[PDB]
């Protein structure tokens, strides 16, 4: 539970070698509305494969 001899800022870096946020670059474009949602999701205006699905 304790540290006896403080690790350098070197090894503090290499522990942070894998924290990097996964990119969500894979956007989609609508079939018959042309707008952009996230893939397998709905827009801000209720479109999903060219349908007013939620009408909100």
């Amino acid at each position: 539970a304790v540290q006896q001899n403080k690790p350098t800022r070197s090894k503090r870096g290499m522990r942070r070698s894998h924290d990097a946020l996964t990119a969500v670059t894979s956007l989609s474009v609508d079939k018959t509305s042309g707008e952009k949602h996230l893939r397998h999701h709905i827009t801000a205006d209720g479109y999903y494969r060219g349908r007013k699905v939620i009408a909100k």
Binding site: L38, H40, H41, I42, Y48, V53, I54
Partner: protein, 120 residues
């Protein structure tokens, strides 16, 4: 170790779990759409689809059966009285899940459950 089990626990005791899925399914058919998280959406489906299955073949005894599982006759009033000819032909599924997005409250995978036949 879950190997070939089912019915996710959703981090509540069984007594709490069953009593929520009542009052979401009561809430589901009254407003016809709900926003929930993804698993509750994914597992309200496995609970509600018995109801409109056991309400096409209308009987006297099945009224209490959807009252023993519901204890809400106003929801039972919408069943059997509109839902009958609404679902004669759908041999099977009645929910088109929609993956909406992300809860700005606490980063949940939000979603949308509906009955299929929508015109309002």
């Amino acid at each position: 170790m879950r190997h070939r089990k089912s019915g996710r626990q959703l981090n509540r005791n069984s007594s709490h779990r069953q009593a929520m899925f009542r009052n979401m399914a009561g809430s589901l058919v009254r407003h016809e759409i709900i926003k929930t998280t993804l698993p509750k959406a994914k597992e309200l489906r496995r609970v509600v689809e018995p109801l409109i299955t056991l309400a096409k073949t209308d009987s006297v005894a099945n009224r209490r059966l959807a009252f023993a599982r519901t204890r809400d006759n106003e929801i039972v009033a919408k069943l059997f009285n509109e839902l009958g000819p609404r679902f004669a032909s759908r041999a099977g599924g009645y929910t088109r899940i929609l993956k909406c997005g992300f809860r700005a409250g606490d980063n949940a995978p939000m979603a949308y459950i509906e009955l299929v036949d929508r015109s309002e």
